[PDB]
Amino acid sequence: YIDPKHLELEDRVVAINRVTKVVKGGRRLRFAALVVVGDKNGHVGFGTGKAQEVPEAIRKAIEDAKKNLVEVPMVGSTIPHEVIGVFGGGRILMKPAVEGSGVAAGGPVRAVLELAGVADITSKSLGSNTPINVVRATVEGLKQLKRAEEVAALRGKSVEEII
Amino acid sequence: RNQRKVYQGRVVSDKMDKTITVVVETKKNHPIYGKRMKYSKKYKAHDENNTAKVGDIVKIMETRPLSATKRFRLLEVVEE
Amino acid sequence: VMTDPIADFLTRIRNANMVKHETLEVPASKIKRDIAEILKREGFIRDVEYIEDDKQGVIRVFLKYGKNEERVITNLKRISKPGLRAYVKADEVPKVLNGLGIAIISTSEGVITDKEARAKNIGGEVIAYVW
Amino acid sequence: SRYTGPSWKVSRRLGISLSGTGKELARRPYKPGQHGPNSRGKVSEYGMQLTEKQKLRHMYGMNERQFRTLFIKASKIKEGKHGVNFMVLLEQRLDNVVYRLGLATTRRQARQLVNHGHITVDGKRVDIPSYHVEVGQVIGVREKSQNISTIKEAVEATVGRPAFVSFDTEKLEGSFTRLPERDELYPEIDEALVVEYYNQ
Amino acid sequence: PTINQLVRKPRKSKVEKSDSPALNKGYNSFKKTQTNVNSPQKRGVCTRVGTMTPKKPNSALRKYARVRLSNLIEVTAYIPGIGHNLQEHSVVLLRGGRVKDLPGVRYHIVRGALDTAGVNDRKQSRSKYGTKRP
Amino acid sequence: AVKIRLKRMGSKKSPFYRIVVADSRSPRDGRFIETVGTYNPLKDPAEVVLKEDLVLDWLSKGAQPSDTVRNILSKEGVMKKHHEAKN
RNA sequence: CGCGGUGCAUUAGCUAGUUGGUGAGGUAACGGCUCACCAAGGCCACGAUGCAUAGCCGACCUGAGAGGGUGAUCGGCCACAC
RNA sequence: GACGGUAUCUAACCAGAAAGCCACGGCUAACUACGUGCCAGCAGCCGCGGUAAUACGUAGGUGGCAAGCGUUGUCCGGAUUUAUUGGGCGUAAAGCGAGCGCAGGCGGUUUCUUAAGUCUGAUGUGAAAGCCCCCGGCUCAACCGGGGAGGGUCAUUGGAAACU
C-alpha cells in the first residue's frame, strides 16, 4: 500500500467517455473519466469516476487513482528490464531505453509512464487500444518489474554475483 | 595437389552396366524456420567392374565427365 | 507420449512453484541433474537431492520461498524444443532480464549458465530461461 | 529559404521570448491573430511536442530539412543525451557562435553578417551561416568590415557573454573554450519533447 | 501450426489489389495486348458527360464523365470543382481517387490539363482545380 | 596486354586517379586486376602514393605503363629500380 | 561440379540419343558431342514435365529486427544487333 | 587548355530586381465572418450541406513547409492483417464424422565411441564502388579522396564433446 498523502501528486485525464443508459423516457447520458495520478518520481495510479458532469467525473477518478497508487521500480531514467503486462485486450510490452531516448510510447501508456516519472523507455501495444485496458496492462507490467536488490535478497546472492 | 570432392552415399540403382546411382542424403536448415530438413542428392558414378550392389554404402570421388551424366568414380564399398 | 523430459521437468517446477509446494519429485537424468544443480547454486531452488531406485533414479527439489512466501522463481521457459532446436553462437548468448534471470545452456564445456558461457566465449544449445 | 516575417508574432506563438528579453511578450503575451486574446482549449501532446520543436528551430532560424539532418547527426553521437547533443550542435552553428560572441544583437543580424562575409573563421572568410564551429576556432570580424556602427554597437552593448565563450573586444575575436552546457543554454526548452517528436 | 507444419506448407500472404486498376495497365497497338505499366495519370476521351445521383445519405447531381482511356479501358470519372467545359469527344487526363458518394467512380478528372479548364473564380486551393494565380 | 594505367575518379572538374593494373581491353573505369597507387594532379606538387613492390612485380611480369604512369614511376624512382633489376 | 535466389498440382507423369556400355569419328579439350551396334535405362510428390512471368548480382528503398519490395544511374557477368 | 577569360579575387552602386504552395470538424498544428441552403459542392475514413455550416464558396486571420508546395501512381511501415522472432480454432473465421495406417515429423534411462549437426581457432576468399566507423579535401554541406569494419547457413584445416 502506498499512502497518497505526503506525495505531491499531479493528475492527467487520460480519456473521458460519454456512456449512455437507455431509459423509458430515452437516454441518460453520463461521463466516465479515466484519470492517472502520479508523483513523477516512482509512484502512479489510475482511477475511474462516473458522474453527470465532467468536473465531478474527473474528481471521482482522481480520488480513485489516489487510493490505487503503486510503486514502479526505476533504474536511472528507465525501467530495470523488459516486461509484458497483459490485462484483457490490453497487452503492452515495455523495454528499457538508452539515456535520453525519450518516452517511445503511445496513448495512455505515455500518461502512465510520464506521471510515474520514467523519462526514457520503449513500448508497444500489441493488444486492444481501449484506454482502461491498456492502462491496466501497463500497471500490471510495472508491478511485474523487479528490483535488482530484492532479486539478490531472494536468491541469497550479492548483486555483483547476480550480474 | 588439389583435392576433388568425395561423397559417402548409398547405391539405389545398379541396373546399368559400368555405373551406379548413389544418394548422399544430407540435411539442410529451412531458411525461414531453421529446422533441419532431409535432402537427398544422388549422383551417377562409374563402376569399373560392377562390384557395388543396390543398398550399399560407398564412397565416390568427383572426376572429369565420363558420360552425359557421369561425374564420379567409385572408390570403396563401405558396407553391403 | 513424453517427448521433452526437460520441458516436463521445467513445467513440473513451474506448477509446483505456482501452487507454492515445498518439494517436487521427477524421474532422474543427467541433464535434469545438471539443471537442478545450476538452479541450486544460482539460488533459485532451496535444495536438491537424489534417490537411487531400479528404473532411472529420482530427483527431489526443495523450492525456495523468500520472506512473506514470495516466489523466488518467477517462471521458466523451454527454449530449445524437439520440434525446433535452438543454438546460439558465443556472441549470441542471451541475457535474461538484463542478467537478473539466467539462461541454462549446454556446451562442449558442459551445461552452464549464460554468464559462464559468455565468460568462456563459447556458444551452445539454449536449454532454458529461468527468472 | 530564410524567414523574414515578424519576430514578435513568432515568439508569442511559441510562448517564449526568442530575443531573450521578453520585449515581444511584454504586451499581448499570447498567440497572434484575432483568436489570440480570448482563451482556447488545451493543446494536445502532439501540439506540445510541435511547439517545442518550433521553439528550437525558430530560436536558431533553421529550415525544417536542415533541422532534421542536424538532429540525425546529433543522434549519431554515442555519448551523452541526444537532446543535449543536438542543443550543443545548434549552438556550434556559426550564426549562434557570432550571436554568443555578441558581434550582433540578434541572431538574424549575426546570420546576415556571416552571409555577407563580414566574419572570418581562423582568418579565412566563411559565408556559410550553417558552418559548424569546432571548439577553439577563432571567429573574427573581417578587417575591412571591423569599422561598422552595427557591430561596434553590438559589441559595446553586449554586457554578458556565456561562460563557454571567450572573447576579446579590441581584436573583435572570440571562440568557444568548451562545449556549452544544458543549464548554460536555454533552460526553458525541453529537448526531450523534441527528441520524442522526431521519434514520431 | 507446428514448425513441421509450417515447413510443409509455409505461410502465404494475401495479395492486395489496386484501388485504381485502369491506371496500372498500358496498351500496345502492335501486339494489340495490354501492358502492365504503372502510370500516375492516363489520357482518355470523354465518351459521355452528365450527372449522377449520390448514394442514399447524400443528395446532389455529381458531375461525371464516361471516358475511354488510351489503354482502351472505359471508366467513369468525377469532375471536381464548380462548372466545367467538358463535352463528349473531349480529351481529358484522369488521376486516381475514389468517390464515396458514387458507386462506380474510381477516378478524378485533372482540372487545368488538356481540355479540362480551370475552375473559374477559384481563389483557394487553386493548384487543385487548376487555376492560375490572379 | 597488361597496363599499369590511370583510372579516373573524383568529380566533374576535380579529377583524381588510381594507378591500377588492368587488361588493356577493359574499360577505363571498368574491370581492373589490382590497384597499385593513386595520383592527384590538382596538387601543385602532384601527390602520389605507390605500392612499389607490387608495381615492380607487375613490371617484371610484363605490365606496360602508360605515358603518364611511366612519368610517375620515373619521378618515384621505381622505373630505375626495375631497370637495375633487369641489368 | 556442391550450394542459393519466382508462382501455378484447377499442371502427374516425362524421356527414345533418351539412360549407360563397346567401338569409331569429332573437338583446344572431357563428354551421346555425333554415328554403328549392345542392353533398357534415366528424371519424378525432396515437384519431373508443362504453363506464366523474369536478364542475374554488388547493390537500392523500407523495417527495431526478422523480413518485405526493387534490379534506374555506377561496377561485374550473360544475351542480343531488322 | 575544348572547358575559358570558366572557377575565383578585388573595387563601386542600390533594399533596391528576387515567395509561393497546402491546410485550419476529429484523426491533426491551425477560427471567425459573411454568400449558400441535402442546391452548389467537399471528402483519405468517420461524415459535412435541408435558411445562424469553424466540414461547401469567398474574405480576414492562423498552422505546416519552403523555391518549393499539394494530388495522383507504386514499395515498405504502421499490419501480431500469414504471428520463426510474433496470433489462433467451445460460443467471434477456424478440430477432418470416426478410425487403420505407408512415408514423413517427434521420441524413455544409461556406459563407451564417432564427430553429421552444434560451438570454437587459423588460413583463403566474399572485386571495385556503395552503406557504417575514423581521417583528410572542396569557404560549409552535398560531393570527393585515404584507411578500416561489415557482409557466407562459403572451402580447407585444428580443436571441444554437454545436446541432437
Ligand SMILES: CN[C@@H]1[C@H](O)[C@H](NC)[C@H]2O[C@@]3(O)C(=O)C[C@@H](C)O[C@H]3O[C@@H]2[C@H]1O
Ligand atoms: C403510471 N405513471 C407513469 C409511471 O409512474 C412510470 N414509472 C413506471 C413513470 O416513469 C417516468 O418517471 C420515467 O422515468 C419515464 C418517463 C417516460 O415517464 C415518467 O413518468 C411515468 C409515469 O407517467
Ligand SMILES: [K+]
Ligand atoms: K559412348
Ligand SMILES: [K+]
Ligand atoms: K537473335
Ligand SMILES: [K+]
Ligand atoms: K476538414
Ligand SMILES: [K+]
Ligand atoms: K508462431
Ligand SMILES: [K+]
Ligand atoms: K470432433
Ligand SMILES: [K+]
Ligand atoms: K560433431
Ligand SMILES: [Mg+2]
Ligand atoms: Mg474498479
Ligand SMILES: [Mg+2]
Ligand atoms: Mg533547400
Ligand SMILES: [Mg+2]
Ligand atoms: Mg601541377
Ligand SMILES: [Mg+2]
Ligand atoms: Mg523480358
Ligand SMILES: [Mg+2]
Ligand atoms: Mg514491423
Ligand SMILES: [Mg+2]
Ligand atoms: Mg487541433
Ligand SMILES: [Mg+2]
Ligand atoms: Mg477542399
Ligand SMILES: [Mg+2]
Ligand atoms: Mg471552408
Ligand SMILES: [Mg+2]
Ligand atoms: Mg507484417
